[PDB]
Amino acid sequence: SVQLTEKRMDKVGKYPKELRKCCEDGMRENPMRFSCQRRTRFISLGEACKKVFLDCCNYITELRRQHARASHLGLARSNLDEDIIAEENIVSRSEFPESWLWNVEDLKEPPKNGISTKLMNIFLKDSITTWEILAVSMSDKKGICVADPFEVTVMQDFFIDLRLPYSVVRNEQVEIRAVLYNYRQNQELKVRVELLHNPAFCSLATTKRRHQQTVTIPPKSSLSVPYVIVPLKTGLQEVEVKAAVYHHFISDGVRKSLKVVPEGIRMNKTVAVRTLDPERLGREGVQKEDIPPADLSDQVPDTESETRILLQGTPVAQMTEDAVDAERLKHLIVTPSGCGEQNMIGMTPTVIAVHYLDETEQWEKFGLEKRQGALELIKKGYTQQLAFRQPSSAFAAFVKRAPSTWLTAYVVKVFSLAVNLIAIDSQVLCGAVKWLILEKQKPDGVFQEDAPVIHQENNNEKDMALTAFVLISLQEAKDICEEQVNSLPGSITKAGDFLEANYMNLQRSYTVAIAGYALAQMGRLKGPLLNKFLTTAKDKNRWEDPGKQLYNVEATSYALLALLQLKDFDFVPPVVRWLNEQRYYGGGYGSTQATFMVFQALAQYQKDAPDHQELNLDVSLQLPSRSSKITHRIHWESASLLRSEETKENEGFTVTAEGKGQGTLSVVTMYHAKAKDQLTCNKFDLKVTIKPAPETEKRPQDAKNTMILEICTRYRGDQDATMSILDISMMTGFAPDTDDLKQLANGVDRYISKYELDKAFSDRNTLIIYLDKVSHSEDDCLAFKVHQYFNVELIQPGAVKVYAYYNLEESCTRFYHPEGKLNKLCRDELCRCAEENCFIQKSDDKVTLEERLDKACEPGVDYVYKTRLVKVQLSNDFDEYIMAIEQTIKSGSDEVQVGQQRTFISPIKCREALKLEEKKHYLMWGLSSDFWGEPNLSYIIGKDTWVEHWPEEDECQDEENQKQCQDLGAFTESMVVFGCPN
């Protein structure tokens, strides 16, 4: 109604061709509700585009306001008129089912009058299309003959499709559905759908009786049969519906797999990165390392955590074995890789690994068969990188955007290292080098930058770092494009002279280190300059700078490379020891730049080692949880130089090694953390709010409701973040509106660089938004619409995380959830399977003294308490009940005193079943392992935890409570004095 497309098209038809796109996007309304005076600030074009945008937006705004004021009534009772869009730019189909039957055969049967017949059987695919088999025959006597296409029309009449959410969190009530399609023109199917029982979730079909429904599907129509399942188990479980048609013989039934995940958000934490050099660090040829247990403070109740320890026989072994392989190469980092620079995972790690293995010659024992695989990986990576190449021989950060000098230099540096491996086109690299030298170099010897910055930048210490980086890039292509590009040595000399001229005024550690490495490559690192390089190191162990974490790692890598270029082997071992330590995220490093720089520095150190050898590590692990001692020996010419061990419990152990080498140890733990807003955000301030959509407007047919998610983020630092990323994890059944994201990205305004809906997202669907920068002065806000397709109750909150790519230390996490609780399935049996947990099978209404005595202190039970409720802290996922201990009938593995306080944590689904109240007395007994605290000493209301509401003393005199007060008192006295007979 409010689109008003006709006059929009009319106005656009009266503008020049180049200005049509500028005005077309000036009329469509963005979801953030921005007046076009503010929107014009985001237009990265000329003043003509800004003027046209502003004029068109004001015109259409006034026009549509008048239309909505005149022809819209709130009491009309007549539906608003809808106009067909009648758009242009229509795109033809481009997705067709993949081809099959890619096999060759030779006819060998005895010919009959020249014709040889061969009978071949094929298995038709499950696509409802019409295949066209194409046959071509080759014979040495007659030649090539092309047969006519053969048409195989696959058809079906009744189709059952089972609609499921991607993943439903445990203890979430979700309505999966089965859609039955009838394709008969004038026939009505009479199907008998049935839901098979599954132990994992209590369907409406109990084990005693299966659930069957007879539904009639109208001709040329479809019917949806909704089902409700609540999952109480984790993993992947099968949902099956069996449908049998009447009088049509069709018995089609569809089975699908549903993934159910714990309530929290899975995280990987590093607890130990200790190096292994017993010859020097150890006491006397023996090293002892004490490994503390992981924190696991915020672990989600009833969720197992797995700890893994990895033994490196070489500081470079893990990255090498990861880079050579394909399915594991993507795990070197923990960040997305969808832009210009981050797309170097395919090329740089594999290139460095291949070069290091070649110059060390470890292929004979590692396996020469893998080299071709690595080459293929590099080829694929190179094929991807050409997507970012502008026609002007320059590489841009994103597709079809301003070319970046820094990225072009990095690409040239990586390409110059791979010509000896794969068939890198010389035209591309030479054109990039020529572009860098001609169009971006100032006469003074400084490389200009015009595109928005990607890394961290009188303009001093900014041009120095960029010039040093570009010089390091050019020194790799010195002998490659020397013939196509002539003035390269002059540019290198000018850049080196400029670097030497202003090298004494540097103050930051990063610029000092990078300029020192550039000079050491050029050979000008001599005299007082060398002293400036050495004195910058703090503790003679690192080129550290306060605040920055990954930049410090990169600068230390540059310094180590410079030291190697200086042919020094005394100041290096401390730097190598420090660099092997800073593995914060997972088992390795976070970003790509720091990872690649450490890889390069360590590989260079290993290459120039004076035949170090002496790799005879023998690591003995004394795990308290295991009676038998664990031992691994890693000698030279071993199989993989990597040894991994796994544990299902959190504990601290000790590591013993006997020397003869320099190994590394890394311990990482995997667990789930409760959905709580991060207490302290290092540098980003984030606020995320989800609200119902003011008007339905355009909604997908399947979507049940639409909501608007609005995110506002700001950078608390002095300068804008170099590059930042929004990782948005979404609740069950929710999908974003792709039209809004496309409008945000592709539009002239370009609020977001690009969006990516495809990731691993093993837990829940994730959306990644690449923000070019975050403004420190004011909040940067963006909003888009998310639609729900499956209705859900007790829905868990979603997470939004904003972090700087090149420095992952500065990240902020927030949680959003739509605004007692209401369920959707309370029936005779469905309300009981959900509530079957957190309680015992007793109904707490007909409790007998004998039954209570028998079930009170069963050998499984290890504690029985009589406490009082202090307060109720109801939360989104787990409720907190702080119980004041009144008297402990018996004591177990946990020590308490009268008057002390404890806290019990209960699942949200059991809030109504518990129905606890303020300032009331209760009696609970439970198992021995029902203690959660390691301090807090929290307890979990499990399946063997009893809850009885102790009547108040003044209310014990009523008819409905005197029958129970005396029984409870007698029971308590009997167990206090007489104890348990059994």
Ligand SMILES: *[C@@H]1O[C@H](CO)[C@@H](O)[C@H](O)[C@H]1NC(C)=O
């Ligand atoms: C956590 O670390 C382990 C051990 O290195 C790894 O297998 C796992 O993939 C990592 N994280 C996740 C979220 O799976």
